[PDB]
Every structure is written in structure tokens, then in C-alpha cells.
């Protein structure tokens, strides 16, 4: 349903913004693995959480 997809997309962005704010929840070692393909750290974490 469109409502479920819209709700999930907005909630996913809100969580990602909060986890990366201030001191990031996940370490730099994980970000290196997720960014090895050229994607940004925020983008790589968002896909993996999904």
C-alpha cells in the first residue's frame, strides 16, 4: 500500500538522521565497509538497515 511505503520511507529517514547526529552510533569500521563501493556513509547504512 502507498500508506505503508510512505510511512516506512519517512520513518527510515528520521532514524538515519538521528543515529548519525552528534556522535554516530555505528563506528568508522562499519562505514569503511559500507562505503567501499563509493556510496556515502549515510546511504550505505540506510540500505543495510532496510
Amino acid at each position: 500500500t502507498s500508506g505503508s511505503i510512505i510511512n516506512h520511507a519517512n520513518n527510515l529517514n528520521k532514524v538515519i538522521n538521528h543515529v548519525f547526529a552528534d556522535k554516530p552510533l555505528i563506528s568508522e569500521t562499519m562505514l569503511k565497509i559500507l562505503t567501499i563501493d563509493g556510496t556515502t556513509g549515510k546511504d550505505g547504512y540506510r540500505n543495510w538497515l532496510d
Binding site: 500500500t1 502507498s2 500508506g3 511505503i5
Partner: protein, 50 residues
Amino acid sequence: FLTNTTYDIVNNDTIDVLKMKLRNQGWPFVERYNAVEIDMSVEPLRSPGQ
């Protein structure tokens, strides 16, 4: 491109014949994939909903 032929040679070939030629060479992408229908609703507000 992949089986080293020309358009005139394969002009009269059917879909199943073309699928066999590509699959033998090692190409698996020979199928169309049906999309998934996502159900959508517009909240009524002033007008009736859709």
C-alpha cells in the same frame, strides 16, 4: 551480440528458439518480469475519495 550472428539470420526465429540460443551460450536474462501492483488511496477531505 552474444551468439555472433546477424539480424537477417535470426529474423524468423521465435522467442523459444531465441531463448535456447542465449541460454546455451550462458546468458540467463531472457525473461520478462511482471511488476507488483501497489494499492493506493486518496483521503477524501472536501471531495469524495479515489
